[PDB]
Design a protein around this nucleic acid. Structure first.
Lengths: 204, 95, 211, 147, 52
RNA sequence: ACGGACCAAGGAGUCUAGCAAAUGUGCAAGUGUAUAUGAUUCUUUAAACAUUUUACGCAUAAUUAAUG
RNA sequence: UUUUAAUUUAUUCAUUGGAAUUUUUCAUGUCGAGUCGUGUUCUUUGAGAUUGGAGCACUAAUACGUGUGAUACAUUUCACA
RNA sequence: GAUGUUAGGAGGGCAAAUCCGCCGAAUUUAAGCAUAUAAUUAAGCGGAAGAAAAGAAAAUAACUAUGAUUCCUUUAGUAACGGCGAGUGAACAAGGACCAGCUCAAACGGUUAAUCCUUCGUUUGGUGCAAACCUUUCGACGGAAUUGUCGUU
């Protein structure tokens, strides 16, 4: 029952104890490298509430992602286009910083592992921090498990690059069903293709 | 329109309970959690401000506290819930 | 535009040749899926490949009168038939935990249908001629001679098919037994006029019931 | 069908039936409905008067199933039942036909037409028109409301 | 350029089709029509020919 | 006034979507059997054949911003 | 030739374990937090006093809740999840 | 934590018609043009499979109610959006194809981690001429794991 206690404390984030812990841990993380392995999860309750377990093939990585939007990538500061597109500064990326977090770590740094999820951990004025759960598809401990061995087969490769993690489902509109989303359900591009696609029967 | 779980519907098509005439049919652990977590954490700064602002205790104070909670949380329902909860805890703690 | 013609609105202003598709392979795929289901039915071993579905009313007010096959029977329907769902999925019975029986007529129209389906079950042994009584409300099993004499008759598919519903549009009553004094139009107008206050009354009734 | 086309009959006429001075240029007046209110305004006013502007509230989402309501007039009520049934109904004065138009797919009954004088008809309809009621009651029938 | 989405097939009314089938069946039952179509039937006895 | 030194071959109102008019055809207050379904149809067969006693499209009623 | 429907053969000895179907009691439990949500900005959408997403600020409740029910708001019912 | 010419393993690149993310125009139309349209397209970057993705309601309805997702006919060029200009444009219900549903989070085993992995040898029988392959479990050792695996729903 310790995890319920842990969740209830972490639900505050504004008490004196939570403020002190967040401050000190954020300070340590800022000086720690951008992407680095953590021996044990710093939020065991949240890790295990997500897909993390305690088998040998599970690792945890902490990543720092710069806050704010990234600005248009146009040369100098000037685009050759219409006023509708001359905007450069207020460009908001569709991928959330949470998804970019494990995008950094699962791309090439840990290519032999598969991203399962990522959680909050910390914050700063100019950085956002996260911890990412990685699974080794090749360790026999996870591979032999009748559970959680779906990640071993090569269909779940680079879920964070393909937008298949929780953050990906969030920014793809998959976290809302019904009439609010409507279009995004079979994926936005596939739905648009289906709606633009016109079918003609042979016999008219 | 509106139906009624009792008084079965009339055969009329438009009005009150219209339609066919078919027949119808029909924490001690939590308190311990809350107590220990309250002991460890206390109140957030806006909780403290709302507590003292209710404490000073006027009608204008209650209105200002409702406005503050609504601004700090978004929506009106959440602000009302928090204001009622904090005055409840104020009464409880004034023991 | 010119002359007297309907103003064009042809939504064809983008790259549409990429999206145009023609179904040359319509009858081909109809045949391929025909043989697919025939192969499945031949291979499964004489058991029908269809699954029983509830006969249930269509939603909305457009299709109030019509009825159609639904997605699985309800838990209370299966319990009334005497089958737990977790063991009734085994006999080709569809079940969903989302439907709720809102009327005794809906309950009683599916209960006897489930009983009719249960009346045709012919269980098979598993352990090389060691027939048993069964589990979980599934009917009993038959022996060598019994299976050898039943496995070769005509299978029944009408029950699997949607239930044909015969509703007597053509019917009549005695002339003296008519309520000549009724005012249908006035009744409709009065109900529409009085709709608001009855909603008021139900609101206050339920507020009282909350106490 | 190419051999029946008008262009085939003027293969050696240089201008292909599109004039010698005016010629056949590509979009000489604009594309689509370009010239509304400016230079195709005469055509718009002569063939599509009420095109421009907007009127009425907005029904934010319609859900046409809510207001779906097929209609039938009184003079067609005797048409649904077969000829033999109609014959056996008209002769005997002690028996009257009961018609559930919602079975046939009709929801409201309007009163356009003329009902056969002195044959009572009981009609079960989801909705009824006032004059339809009046005609039925005058002929001696009675309207039944169903849902 | 020729495109695959040309109107290759045609929709013929089922009533059209059964009318045409009946008409062709009837035409097969008159000696003059089948003779003129191209069949050399001067030696057969009856034009609605039937065999056991 | 512009093109044309000569000859051979190729060379340009077409295809699809949607609407209307015209005419022919079938049925007719109905009409079209859509997707699909079955059938000892299954070089020819990717077409023909059929639809266990209310799918929808258009028409059969219009008018109003709209309760209607 | 691959398998897949029907089809030669079960008999015992043994305790060893487990499972599933149905009666008496408890206990009405748990139910995903910098998350939802709100404000603002940009983008996206048929979505329009904002459809979704994203950036920043604020930052929840605990099932008697909050989330939808296509017009913003207050008080309050109902339905579904 | 650092380090291993420690033991055992993976990632890189090629290939894209279908598929999944990001980024992202303009030509064009509006007979001009700036919102709009082109287009959530072209180009660019990254990532898989034989299909991918979506998928088991924080759904729809308002009815006698339905019951994961996907696709086809239709809703429907409709509701709606739009210098309300040019143009853009769904969703519910309905008819079908197909149809399988499930497990992690807390309870309890604390009169016993009941779990998981590595390595080293033995055997339980087999189809192959062979090579290999399917099955076999006595273990022992070394660990991981109570900062929580499995059993229990």
């Amino acid at each position: 029952g310790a995890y319920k206690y842990i969740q209830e404390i972490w639900k505050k984030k504004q008490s004196d104890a939570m403020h002190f812990l967040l401050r000190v841990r954020t300070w340590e993380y800022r000086q720690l490298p951008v992407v680095h392995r953590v021996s044990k999860p710093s939020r065991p309750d949240k890790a295990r509430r997500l897909g993390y377990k305690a088998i040998q093939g599970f690792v945890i990585y902490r990543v720092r992602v710069r806050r704010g939007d990234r600005k248009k990538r146009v040369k100098k500061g000037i685009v050759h286009g219409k006023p509708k597109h001359q905007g450069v500064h207020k460009q908001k990326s569709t991928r959330n910083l949470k998804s970019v977090a494990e995008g950094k770590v699962g791309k090439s740094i840990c290519g032999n592992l598969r991203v399962l999820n990522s959680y909050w951990v910390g914050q700063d004025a100019v950085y956002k921090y996260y911890e990412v759960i990685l699974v080794d598809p090749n360790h026999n401990a996870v591979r032999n498990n009748p559970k959680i061995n779906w990640i071993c087969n090569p269909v779940h490769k680079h879920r964070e690059l393909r937008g298949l993690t929780s953050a990906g489902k969030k920014y793809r509109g998959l976290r809302v069903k019904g009439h609010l989303s409507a279009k995004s359900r079979p994926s936005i591009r596939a739905n648009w293709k289906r709606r633009q696609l016109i079918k003609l029967r042979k016999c008219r | 329109g509106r139906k009624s779980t009792i008084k079965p519907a009339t055969g009329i098509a438009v009005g009150f309970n219209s339609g066919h005439v078919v027949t119808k049919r029909n924490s001690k652990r939590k308190e311990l959690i809350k107590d220990v977590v309250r002991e460890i954490t206390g109140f957030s700064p806006y909780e403290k401000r709302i507590i003292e602002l209710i404490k000073i205790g006027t009608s204008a104070s209650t209105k200002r506290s409702l406005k503050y909670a609504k601004k700090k949380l978004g929506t009106h329902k959440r602000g009302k819930a928090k204001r009622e909860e904090i005055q409840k805890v104020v009464i409880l703690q004034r023991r | 535009v010119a002359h007297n013609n309907v103003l064009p609105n042809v939504h064809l202003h983008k790259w549409w040749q990429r999206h145009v598709r023609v179904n040359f392979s319509k009858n081909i795929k109809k045949k391929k899926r025909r043989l697919l289901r025939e192969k499945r039915r031949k291979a499964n071993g004489g058991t029908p490949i269809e699954k029983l579905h509830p006969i249930v009313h269509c939603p909305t007010q457009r299709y109030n009168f019509r009825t159609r096959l639904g997605k699985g029977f309800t838990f209370e329907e299966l319990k009334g038939a005497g089958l737990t769902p977790r063991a009734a999925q085994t006999i080709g019975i569809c079940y969903d935990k989302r439907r709720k029986n809102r009327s005794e007529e809906s309950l009683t129209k599916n209960v006897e249908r489930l009983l009719k389906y249960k009346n045709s079950l012919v269980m098979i042994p598993l352990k090389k001629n060691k027939a048993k009584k069964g589990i979980g409300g599934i009917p009993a099993d038959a022996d060598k001679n019994t299976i050898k004499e039943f496995r070769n008759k005509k299978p029944l598919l009408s029950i699997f098919k949607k239930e044909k519903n015969t509703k007597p549009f053509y019917e009549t009553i005695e002339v003296s037994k008519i309520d000549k004094e009724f005012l249908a139009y006035k009744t409709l107008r009065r109900a529409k006029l009085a709709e608001r206050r009855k909603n008021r009354r139900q609101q206050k009734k339920d507020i009282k019931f909350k106490s | 069908a190419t051999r029946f086309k008008k262009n085939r009959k003027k293969r050696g006429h240089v201008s292909a039936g599109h004039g010698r001075v005016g010629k056949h240029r590509k979009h000489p007046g604009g594309r689509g409905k370009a010239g509304g209110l400016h230079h195709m305004r005469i055509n718009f006013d002569k063939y599509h008067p009420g095109y421009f502007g907007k009127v009425g509230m907005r029904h934010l989402n319609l859900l046409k199933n809510r207001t779906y309501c097929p209609t039938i007039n009184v003079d067609k009520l005797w048409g649904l039942l077969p000829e033999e049934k109609k014959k056996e109904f008209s002769e005997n004065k002690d028996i009257a036909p009961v018609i559930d138009v919602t079975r046939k797919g009709y929801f409201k009954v309007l009163g356009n037409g003329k009902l056969k004088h002195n044959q009572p008809i009981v009609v079960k309809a989801r909705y009824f028109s006032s004059v339809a009621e009046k005609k039925i009651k005058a002929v001696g029938g009675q309207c039944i409301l169903v849902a | 350029p020729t495109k695959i989405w040309r109107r290759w097939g045609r929709k013929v009314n089922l009533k059209e089709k059964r009318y045409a089938v009946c008409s062709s069946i009837a035409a097969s039952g008159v000696t003059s029509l089948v003779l003129a179509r191209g069949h050399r039937i001067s030696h057969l006895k009856e034009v609605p020919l039937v065999v056991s």
